[PDB]
Amino acid sequence: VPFVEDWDLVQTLGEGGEVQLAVNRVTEEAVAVKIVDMKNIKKEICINKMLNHENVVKFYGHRREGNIQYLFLEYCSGGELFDRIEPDIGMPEPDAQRFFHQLMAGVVYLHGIGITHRDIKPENLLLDERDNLKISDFGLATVFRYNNRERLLNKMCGTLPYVAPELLKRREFHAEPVDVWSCGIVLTAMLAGELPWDQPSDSCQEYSDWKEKKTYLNPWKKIDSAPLALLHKILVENPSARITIPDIKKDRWYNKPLKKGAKRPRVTS
């Protein structure tokens, strides 16, 4: 079948290099192509070849043309989770619970194969055509468990409003509680439409107020008591005392019926 390998770079999806929407000449299948001008990528492609989950962006393959590296990834027509968050409002609680369930499935998977994303935020959480959440960008990702032996991290990685406090106060820390904390900050953004603090440090007043349990303040005043009880368990300063994903899965709000299924077409009489 001729021309089946030809893709047209239709439009820009993002920057950093750049991400382009690529449409197949013959089949018209859409993919996102990451254009990386090498003048790191070996690890990124290596981690991407291990990934196969419904809540993780699909890696179709890579092609290298001199100094330009082309990463062929999943096109997600729902765009970014970031653009579903209304500033200072957020989104309806049932939508946030469904996206948080899908985010947990994706992070469970990753941790299961010993991968830590290290930069979970709404900019990196993409939505497919049926609004299924997908974890994207393994540029900062790394192997924290190999041959069933855990390796402690020491490197500063992430985005300050989403990083766990141990990453700023300890030399070494465990990988999994760091991804749990960023998921908790994502849940806060989804239910309040604002970030609670610039960084989880004691010099940050908003962060001190949260440790002082001043929940009558923003963003916590906008969040219902059931998801707020969960956030109280996730945004715990001590990474050893922090809730683990198996226990998030037992939380009362996480298992609270709120959301209806996708609305299938119906007729009466």
Ligand SMILES: COc1cc2c(cc1OC)-c1[nH]nc(-c3ccc(-c4nnn[nH]4)cc3)c1C2
């Ligand atoms: C602003 O609107 C969009 C923005 C994006 C997509 C779709 C969009 O609208 C439908 C889309 N589909 N897939 C991606 C995507 C996939 C993977 C990666 C990635 N980065 N590093 N590794 N994988 C980046 C973007 C994007 C961005």
